[PDB]
Amino acid sequence: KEKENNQGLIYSYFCKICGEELAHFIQEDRTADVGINSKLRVFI
Amino acid sequence: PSIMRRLPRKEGRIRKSLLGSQVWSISRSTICGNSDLHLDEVG
Amino acid sequence: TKVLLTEILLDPMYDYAATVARIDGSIPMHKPRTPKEAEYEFKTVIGRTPAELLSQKEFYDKIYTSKYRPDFTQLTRRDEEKTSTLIYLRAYELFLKYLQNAPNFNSELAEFKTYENAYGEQKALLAQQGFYNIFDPNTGRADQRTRLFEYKRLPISTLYDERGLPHKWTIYVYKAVDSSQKPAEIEVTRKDVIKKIDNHYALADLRCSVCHVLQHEVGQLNI
Amino acid sequence: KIFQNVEIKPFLIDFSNLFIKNAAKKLFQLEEQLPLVPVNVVMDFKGISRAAVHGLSRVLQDEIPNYMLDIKPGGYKIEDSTDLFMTEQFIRNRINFIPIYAKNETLVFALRSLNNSCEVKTIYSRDLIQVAGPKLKYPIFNPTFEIGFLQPGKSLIIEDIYIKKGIGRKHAAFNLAVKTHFSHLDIEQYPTDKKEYMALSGYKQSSMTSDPRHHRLGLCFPAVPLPHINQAVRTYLKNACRIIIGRIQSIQKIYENFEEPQPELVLFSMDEEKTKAIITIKDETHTIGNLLKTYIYEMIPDISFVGYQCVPHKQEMVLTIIHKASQEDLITLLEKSIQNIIQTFQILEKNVDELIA
Amino acid sequence: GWYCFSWPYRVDMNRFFQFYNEMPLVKTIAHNYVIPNGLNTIVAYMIYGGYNQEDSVIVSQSFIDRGGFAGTFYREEKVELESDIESFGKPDPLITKNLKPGANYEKLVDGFVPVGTVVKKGDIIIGKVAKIKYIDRSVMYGFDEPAVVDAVMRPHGPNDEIFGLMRLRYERNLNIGDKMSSRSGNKGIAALALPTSDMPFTEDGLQPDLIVNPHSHPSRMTNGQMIETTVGLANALQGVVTDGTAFLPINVQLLSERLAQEGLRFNGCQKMFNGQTGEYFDAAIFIGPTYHQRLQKFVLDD
Amino acid sequence: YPRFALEAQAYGFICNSYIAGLTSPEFIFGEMNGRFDLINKALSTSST
Amino acid sequence: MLIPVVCFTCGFPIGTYAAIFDKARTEYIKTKMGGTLPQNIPLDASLQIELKDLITALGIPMRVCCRTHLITTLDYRKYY
Amino acid sequence: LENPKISTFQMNVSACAWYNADFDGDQMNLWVPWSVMSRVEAELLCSVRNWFISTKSSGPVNGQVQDSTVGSFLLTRTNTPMGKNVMNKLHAMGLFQTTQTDPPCFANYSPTDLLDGKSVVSMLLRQTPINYQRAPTWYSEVYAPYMHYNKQDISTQIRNGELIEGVLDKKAVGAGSSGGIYHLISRRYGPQQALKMIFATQQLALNYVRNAGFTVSTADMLLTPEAHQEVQEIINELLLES
Ligand SMILES: [Zn+2]
Ligand SMILES: [Zn+2]
């Protein structure tokens, strides 16, 4: 956050040693939220 | 929801994802008059 | 305590009571900067500590009540600003009574509504840019003169000649502006205007290509 | 004697009107003239091109340095300003456009308004307390402005109200003179009341052919102290002259360095012994370009071409001069034209000093 | 215009509050019931450089700086929580995961950016992390134009739970690309912004605020706008406000003669000079006060 | 206008000009033709 | 929300005579109002309220823009 | 555009004919090619000079619109309400200071010498000499009986770029004018050369108006009291026949 922004919106991280792009992050996948019969649920 | 419902209409697979396209490296803005620009130039 | 403060600080009732308390100086004019100032403002405005608000059961019974109790019976019609102050104070007092379900409330509400309607009439008097009406000099009021079309049954001689045929105004008659120019008049068709007419001539009148009469002399026909 | 027959007239309040008298006396307890009044100055110029007069007018309008009142960042105290309607943008827009006649950039004011009443209280400009700088022996702005208004039980605290310097072109709050009259006295005019001539300008010579050299220019200044009007207006006029000269002298430093490669001057040797000079200067207006074109054209009647194209979206003035001489002779003629401009505005300085007593 | 008299008490989305409004010099009966929205801009009906062609207008820069059609534009940020999973607070780099690249978390104070600071693109205005160590579901300010945090509050929703409400304010002036319109339906886009010394001026010093092409009229036949300028020009000198409600008796011949009685010309045109050159036009130019209104179509949002 | 009116004004004949102003019946007839321009302009996009 | 400090068009210091022009105007209207409710003033169809001489006595010049903005500007205090 | 306060896509008004666009609030897309293959093809195939001539109607698309159509008429008009339509050397040079072409030579002119609009237009059309002779839109036999047309304004003739006589208006310089000035230049010198002359002739038309003026007022629409009686007397004849 030394540089708040260079007026250009970026979605990727870069290496501090050389500047190479490490990876990118836009949004969390959030699809494993649905993990694994109304009857046993209703019973519990 | 069905597999074949994705195809038909304007917001369908064919007319929105195949015949049309969302693209990067593009800009949009209101146009304006400028009499100092050539006909083949854009401000 | 946090949930109670968050609920009450967002109540417009609290802000209005706080403004009334600020007017006469019961609380500082500046909003609290530290939790102690917020607690003091709550104690002065609501009238009960947030800890003791959760213990007992009322809420509206002890909300601030303005210090100066002016005489609102002069609201029965340095006077005008005092009237505005009375309007504000009575509005607060009546709102507080409405919150508390005070007896004998609707009649006083109607009376103060009439008073505030009169005050609003005065305020609307203060809020006039002005108005003007362009008077007709012949009359003494708003101009009625217009350039609108007015129907009038023209004589039939304007459309048909003495032999019943329709008029065809298609001959342009041009007369010389100065006397020395000759010939005196030239009669041309629309196709021949550019080839025979210069600025030394002016369009006098049209002519019918059937009965050969001038348009301005159409009234000489026997109707 | 280029500049003669100047007349100066202040704009004063007529207290013979009962309505204005009563309103002022019961609002501000005002019974005599305000400390700062607008002043209309009408000036007659003879034997001078309309390019120079119009450039002087433009400089006096929005190219002369001027002072306004501005709020430093963080001056608007959010901790204390409880009013919900007097936003920072509105109040600072009000403050920036108050006409001031300042002495130095050190004065710092403050606006501390507390509303202990039950009615909306109007914050006027008399509620600006000077908190830093030497104490004022005469007000720098009128106390009758309406800065804002506070709802009952609200407050408005603003600190660090300082004096900021700038030119009127960048921001309109630095504008100095407002136009009130401009005419040519050496061109006859039609009576435009007649329906035959009401569609024309009125002058009997077309602007495509006329070259007037006897003008009348009338400008109004918004804030001048009553007992020193002739001292203020004169100063303003003189100021304008220096500014123009200064700007012209900048171009005079370009032509002097035509031997070395200079970015703002480009010289070409065309065919038929023709030479071309292109002068590109950034952040210049039509004033300098028009003056340069007019004086080069006067100096070289048989010039091949001259133009001062000022481009809006390029923020620059490009002066193109094509003439059938060599580079050295062209530069000599350009320096002569610049010297003519300088001496003309020096004569304007002298006439301004001589006229206004 | 004044979109609501209780604007400071409201946290609204995409709302513009124009500071200055004027009653038209030629008002109607509709202004007895609603507040007029616009200004009596001095409009010149002339060809000036070709920048007002094809339904464009030329706007005085000085008119913009003085507050003409200027106001504040509001946006809101309403963020909700998951009950006992998420929370409001500043994340830390060494625990929280997948923080947004090129963000700015240092402006947060107890989870929210303090009121009065300027938030620009890439700044995190609301801090929010979900406890799994932590995952960062923060809210970032994705707008090119910088805003100012106007109001921050933590109300309780219908489910008795805290959600974050933030109001962001934008200082909006009239800039190139903003759409303006007259009361006759002749809308236009601001094309050029000239200083006070480049605008044309009359012999008496009057200069336009807007310069509209004369070619906007003949095909659309907006005669009410031209009559309004003729009537409004005499109202200013006479110091009056007249009524121009539709179907009221008018006589343009008599209204034109009213201009001459006030010292003007019959046609309302005046001698004008070119501000850039100082050269007078060889034609009297029709200039006068025409009520213009700013349509809420901002180029900074489109 | 009355039933079985014979005058031409009752059937859309506008006797006035814009500079002179229209009456209420003339403005309604003008709005009848003006609305067609707006309707056909909308159709000139979808139908085309 | 108030009469501008300077004229929007040219920048003449309208604001320094604004407040007075407000209050004085009111009495003038009270002189010419006449048996009519205040909110019905712009519908009287018989009024001749002219403010030329008032603005002239204020010292403001005969500029179209300045008098237009002085007369026509709405005041937020009078509606809220 | 280096100005940070500009957020719009600015273009010449004569370029609106390609897109059927105007400035009432239209928005237009813009993407800059970055690939070498796509950047080559943009310059060679998709350049707007390739569609100066319409592939639909086989005629020109661009021209003067709404200010250089009436501006060219005033510039090429023979007589002005203030005498002959001439200008001195100083104002003749001022018409060429914006065209962005090479300036002509005014050395053979005294400061008091007068140049008419035909001479000024000629100095620009010498670069691409064409041959044109038609009747301008100014002349119309509908207006002929009630007007005194000038015999040097109803016949626009250009030979080898020299505007011999006539005025330039929608017929000659207007957009979409088949057989017009810019249609002939494109056929003989290329569509790119025609686009430069549209801009070049646009500046003379606009620079002429910088001190000639053009306006519309309410009195431009007002019939005289005597002519108003003639209009309703005509309408009464229609209602009499009806
Ligand atoms: Zn006949
Ligand atoms: Zn003004």
Short mmCIF file of N, CA and C in Angstrom, two decimals, chain C residues 147-156 158-160 169 172 174 190-191 193-195 197-203 206 215, chain H residues 139 141-142 144-151 154 222-225 228-241:
data_model
loop_
_atom_site.label_atom_id
_atom_site.label_comp_id
_atom_site.label_asym_id
_atom_site.label_seq_id
_atom_site.Cartn_x
_atom_site.Cartn_y
_atom_site.Cartn_z
N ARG C 147 -52.62 37.88 -32.75
CA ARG C 147 -52.46 37.77 -34.20
C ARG C 147 -53.05 36.45 -34.71
N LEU C 148 -54.08 35.96 -34.04
CA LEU C 148 -54.72 34.70 -34.40
C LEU C 148 -55.58 34.88 -35.65
N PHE C 149 -55.91 33.76 -36.28
CA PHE C 149 -56.76 33.76 -37.45
C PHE C 149 -58.21 34.03 -37.06
N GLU C 150 -58.87 34.90 -37.82
CA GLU C 150 -60.28 35.21 -37.63
C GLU C 150 -61.03 34.91 -38.92
N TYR C 151 -62.05 34.07 -38.83
CA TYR C 151 -62.80 33.67 -40.01
C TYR C 151 -63.61 34.84 -40.56
N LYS C 152 -63.74 34.87 -41.88
CA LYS C 152 -64.50 35.91 -42.56
C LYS C 152 -64.90 35.39 -43.93
N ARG C 153 -66.20 35.43 -44.23
CA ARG C 153 -66.71 34.94 -45.50
C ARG C 153 -66.37 35.94 -46.60
N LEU C 154 -65.35 35.63 -47.38
CA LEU C 154 -64.96 36.49 -48.48
C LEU C 154 -66.00 36.42 -49.60
N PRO C 155 -66.11 37.48 -50.41
CA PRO C 155 -67.02 37.42 -51.56
C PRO C 155 -66.59 36.35 -52.55
N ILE C 156 -67.58 35.77 -53.24
CA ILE C 156 -67.30 34.70 -54.19
C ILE C 156 -66.49 35.20 -55.38
N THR C 158 -63.72 36.49 -55.37
CA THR C 158 -62.31 36.19 -55.16
C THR C 158 -61.91 34.83 -55.71
N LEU C 159 -62.84 33.89 -55.82
CA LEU C 159 -62.53 32.55 -56.32
C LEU C 159 -62.96 32.32 -57.76
N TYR C 160 -64.01 33.01 -58.22
CA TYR C 160 -64.53 32.81 -59.56
C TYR C 160 -64.79 34.16 -60.21
N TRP C 169 -54.15 32.64 -60.59
CA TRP C 169 -53.23 33.76 -60.46
C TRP C 169 -51.82 33.32 -60.83
N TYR C 172 -47.21 37.40 -63.19
CA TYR C 172 -46.54 38.33 -62.28
C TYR C 172 -46.35 39.66 -62.99
N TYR C 174 -44.73 43.36 -62.85
CA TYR C 174 -43.64 44.10 -62.23
C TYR C 174 -43.65 45.53 -62.75
N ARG C 190 -43.74 32.50 -64.01
CA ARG C 190 -42.73 32.12 -63.02
C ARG C 190 -41.45 31.61 -63.67
N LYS C 191 -41.55 31.01 -64.85
CA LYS C 191 -40.36 30.51 -65.53
C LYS C 191 -39.52 31.64 -66.11
N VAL C 193 -39.18 34.80 -64.80
CA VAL C 193 -38.85 35.86 -63.85
C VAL C 193 -37.35 36.11 -63.83
N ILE C 194 -36.55 35.04 -63.79
CA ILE C 194 -35.10 35.18 -63.72
C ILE C 194 -34.52 35.73 -65.02
N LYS C 195 -35.24 35.61 -66.13
CA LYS C 195 -34.70 35.98 -67.43
C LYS C 195 -35.13 37.37 -67.90
N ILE C 197 -36.54 40.00 -65.34
CA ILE C 197 -36.77 40.92 -64.23
C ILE C 197 -35.46 41.14 -63.50
N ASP C 198 -35.11 42.41 -63.29
CA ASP C 198 -33.93 42.82 -62.54
C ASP C 198 -34.37 43.58 -61.29
N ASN C 199 -33.39 44.12 -60.56
CA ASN C 199 -33.68 44.86 -59.34
C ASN C 199 -34.33 46.21 -59.62
N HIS C 200 -34.37 46.65 -60.88
CA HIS C 200 -35.03 47.90 -61.24
C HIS C 200 -36.54 47.79 -61.25
N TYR C 201 -37.09 46.61 -60.96
CA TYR C 201 -38.53 46.38 -60.98
C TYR C 201 -38.96 45.81 -59.64
N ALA C 202 -40.24 45.98 -59.32
CA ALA C 202 -40.81 45.45 -58.10
C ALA C 202 -42.15 44.79 -58.41
N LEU C 203 -42.43 43.70 -57.70
CA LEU C 203 -43.67 42.96 -57.90
C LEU C 203 -44.84 43.79 -57.39
N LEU C 206 -50.49 40.32 -58.77
CA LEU C 206 -50.63 39.12 -59.58
C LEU C 206 -51.77 39.30 -60.58
N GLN C 215 -55.26 40.93 -59.01
CA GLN C 215 -55.77 40.38 -57.76
C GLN C 215 -56.30 41.48 -56.84
N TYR H 139 -30.47 29.18 -55.69
CA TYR H 139 -31.46 29.52 -56.70
C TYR H 139 -32.62 28.54 -56.66
N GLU H 141 -36.76 28.54 -58.40
CA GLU H 141 -37.82 29.29 -59.07
C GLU H 141 -39.04 29.48 -58.19
N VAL H 142 -39.14 28.75 -57.07
CA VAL H 142 -40.18 29.02 -56.09
C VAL H 142 -39.97 30.39 -55.46
N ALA H 144 -38.07 32.72 -56.92
CA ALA H 144 -37.68 33.68 -57.95
C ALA H 144 -38.63 34.86 -58.10
N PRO H 145 -39.95 34.69 -58.15
CA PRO H 145 -40.82 35.87 -58.35
C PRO H 145 -40.71 36.91 -57.25
N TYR H 146 -40.45 36.48 -56.02
CA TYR H 146 -40.45 37.37 -54.87
C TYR H 146 -39.04 37.76 -54.43
N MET H 147 -38.03 37.46 -55.24
CA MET H 147 -36.64 37.75 -54.91
C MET H 147 -35.96 38.36 -56.12
N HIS H 148 -34.91 39.14 -55.88
CA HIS H 148 -34.05 39.63 -56.95
C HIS H 148 -32.73 38.88 -56.86
N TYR H 149 -32.68 37.72 -57.51
CA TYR H 149 -31.46 36.92 -57.55
C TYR H 149 -30.36 37.66 -58.29
N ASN H 150 -29.14 37.52 -57.79
CA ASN H 150 -27.96 38.06 -58.46
C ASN H 150 -27.54 37.09 -59.55
N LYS H 151 -27.29 37.62 -60.75
CA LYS H 151 -26.95 36.77 -61.89
C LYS H 151 -25.60 36.09 -61.74
N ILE H 154 -26.32 32.47 -59.21
CA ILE H 154 -27.20 31.37 -59.58
C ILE H 154 -26.52 30.39 -60.53
N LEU H 222 -41.41 36.85 -38.04
CA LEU H 222 -42.58 37.67 -37.81
C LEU H 222 -43.01 38.33 -39.12
N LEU H 223 -44.24 38.06 -39.54
CA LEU H 223 -44.81 38.71 -40.70
C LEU H 223 -45.16 40.16 -40.38
N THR H 224 -45.03 41.02 -41.38
CA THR H 224 -45.46 42.40 -41.23
C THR H 224 -46.98 42.45 -41.11
N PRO H 225 -47.51 43.50 -40.46
CA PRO H 225 -48.97 43.59 -40.31
C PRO H 225 -49.72 43.56 -41.63
N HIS H 228 -49.60 39.88 -42.81
CA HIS H 228 -50.48 39.01 -42.03
C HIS H 228 -51.91 39.07 -42.56
N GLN H 229 -52.36 40.26 -42.95
CA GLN H 229 -53.68 40.38 -43.56
C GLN H 229 -53.76 39.62 -44.88
N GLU H 230 -52.64 39.53 -45.60
CA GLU H 230 -52.62 38.78 -46.85
C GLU H 230 -52.62 37.28 -46.62
N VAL H 231 -52.07 36.82 -45.50
CA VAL H 231 -52.03 35.39 -45.22
C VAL H 231 -53.42 34.87 -44.87
N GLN H 232 -54.13 35.57 -43.98
CA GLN H 232 -55.46 35.11 -43.61
C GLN H 232 -56.48 35.33 -44.72
N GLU H 233 -56.26 36.33 -45.58
CA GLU H 233 -57.10 36.48 -46.76
C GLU H 233 -56.94 35.29 -47.70
N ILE H 234 -55.73 34.72 -47.75
CA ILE H 234 -55.52 33.49 -48.51
C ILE H 234 -56.22 32.31 -47.84
N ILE H 235 -56.10 32.21 -46.51
CA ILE H 235 -56.72 31.11 -45.79
C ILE H 235 -58.24 31.21 -45.86
N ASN H 236 -58.78 32.43 -45.81
CA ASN H 236 -60.22 32.61 -45.95
C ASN H 236 -60.72 32.13 -47.31
N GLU H 237 -59.88 32.24 -48.34
CA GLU H 237 -60.25 31.70 -49.64
C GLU H 237 -60.34 30.18 -49.60
N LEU H 238 -59.41 29.53 -48.88
CA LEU H 238 -59.48 28.08 -48.72
C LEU H 238 -60.73 27.67 -47.96
N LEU H 239 -61.07 28.40 -46.89
CA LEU H 239 -62.27 28.08 -46.13
C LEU H 239 -63.53 28.46 -46.90
N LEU H 240 -63.44 29.43 -47.81
CA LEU H 240 -64.57 29.73 -48.67
C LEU H 240 -64.83 28.61 -49.67
N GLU H 241 -63.76 28.08 -50.27
CA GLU H 241 -63.91 26.95 -51.18
C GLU H 241 -64.36 25.70 -50.43
#
